[PDB]
């Protein structure tokens, strides 16, 4: 047998059905049209109908429910800044943890940022800090991936978190795996419980935001919530669900997740089709609703900046959706520089059925060996955003 | 390090507050009360509003579409005393799935339909007794401690064998290379990502079949037993719960205390890792806010059940007790593996302990996982004497 001969899904019978139930689960998904999808030829006001619909939808996946105050257990002299360490109680029986960059001799509040790390990543290495173990350790002597040092120098006060089940949020990886952290068991306990990795993930990172608010050096209406990579996850439900964040900044190529798990069947030589990513990524009844260019679209016409591209249609889809609100420079995009070349990339409507996984990200123009936070792109759109 | 120092879920600050995010989601499972948990000092009235209560709860988390072409015969072949037939029926947009029907020879008047379910890596081929639709795919066929459906038919019954998904003839790519170690994950995964679950899936699919059975003039409509073995059993609690017509039941699989299990089996490996005690296929979101096997299984009295590889004492008698209650306290017959039969060799506790590794916890909850297979030989007997009233 050869799998180029049977990565395509469809049907063997004049009347159209599947035997296979992975047949039947594929032409599902094929058939899910999502609720709040974007349209290119919404009018302002249907516009602005939608943008509210798909808020109200993203709070009934998300399940926030609705507590003891923060506390700062530990103050540090860095140069030029002081680094704080905060406590939070956001659930019965949880405690969380955060870090906080100041510049030193503050006077009239400043803009801050909450920085959200990628996968295996974790606080310390975004503020440049040795991990809380020897195997936890980040890079964080690489400024490509240093969020929150690399802006607290630059004059704003940025804010570091975890991602559930890594750092200090991790389990026993600190005596045996490091950073190849169990996302997926944690995940499966919130499954269970009607929840998700991203929706718990999510909740931890709003009552941050919440306290980001509560500071006096903290301008309010300035925040602005940065992510890489997996990060850009929580960055989209606490940009969706809170109208007041500022500006964001997403630091991941703009995937559509549904057409990605479609089209990516191309079975490996033991046949088995593995899904494009883990029940990290699972938060049931998502397709349902949108995708992710849906929702970074509803953003509009808050500031953004993708820095690592995605499909030109997605792309496409995210400034129109800037100029309807009447503000299409609100939105700024950046391709890898590999894809820079318009003739390196391709315009398409729909990607193609029967693909693996190197084939699906060079349709959508993804770099993985340059795939870092893009320090160089974002900290001068920063300061354009608020030299003011 | 040590992974004997770690088995423990234990807080060590003095607000008890855990900054591990599995030490927070283990507490929230463990301070997750089932709603509709069975109480051994409940009232027949209680009992009945209880029983109620849990349907309907079954019945929100399965998610069954009620929005359909009716079922048709593909294949009929003679076997010795009975025929084969061979049926597709279509569930759901775009999806055919197959099932078995043996009937007897000569078949008189109505007689008891038994509905059997395979377990893990198995098919309807492999319970009718006959061979795989591909080479990879020839479940143990020639074994009847698994043929289950070629074994209801030489004792008179009508036996309708069906597939899990993902697995048999519902199966992809396996034919070609992995074979019984299907991909039900996967599966699993994109209902999941669309609001549903493998089971809410499976129990929709076979609840069909249930209902073609019902309009079979052969089949006494009245005399319908769902039998299950292993996973097989999870579809059959569903259907029990969702149809009150069904006559009897048959729990090929020790009674599990699920969300227990997961709470006490977190001793770690040598890579620090906490394996969950099964894979996704398992996963139904909100199934332990509203109950656990034992009080889904004390739910289907007054109705005939048997149990035929024991479990956790507590739980069987929790069982026993509910059968009680109604008024129908033999209803129920319960046997334990041959090796835990003498009551020396199990323990009497309200609690498993907490820590525990895989090996440890199926002895507890009194396993002999070499011997697990459909016990026809305890089951026959039981159905001869309750098929004649």
Known sequence: WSPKDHNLIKSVREDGRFLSSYGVVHAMLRNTEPRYAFHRDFSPKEFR????????????????????APVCIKREQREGYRLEKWE?????????????????????PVPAILCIPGS??????????????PKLNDRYKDPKLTQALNFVKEGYIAVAVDNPAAG??????????????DYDVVSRYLLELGWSYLGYASYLDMQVLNWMKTQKHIRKDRIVVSGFS???????????LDTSIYAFVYNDFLCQTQERAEVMTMPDKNGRRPFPNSIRHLIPDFWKNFNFPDIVAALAPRPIILTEGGLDRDLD????????????????IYHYKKFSDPDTRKNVEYLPEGLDRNEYFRMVNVDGPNHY??????????????EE
């Open 373 to 386: 936070f893009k320090s160089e792109l974002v900290v001068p759109w920063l300061r354009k955003l608020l």
């Open 49 to 68: 109908k939608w943008q509210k619909g798909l808020r109200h939808a993203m709070e009934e996946i998300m399940k926030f429910p609705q507590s003891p």
């Open 88 to 108: 939070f109680y956001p659930l019965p029986k949880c405690v969380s943890t955060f870090l906080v960059l100041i510049p030193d001799n503050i006077n009239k």
């Open 168 to 181: 200090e949020a991790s389990d026993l990886e600190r005596y045996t795996l490091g950073s190849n952290y």
């Open 317 to 332: 889809l995210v400034r129109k959706a800037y100029a309807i609100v009447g503000t299409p420079d609100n939105v700024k």
């Open 120 to 133: 295996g990543g974790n606080k310390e290495g975004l503020a440049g800090e040795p991990g809380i173990a």
């Open 230 to 240: 997996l990060g850009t996850e929580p960055m989209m439900v606490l940009g969706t």
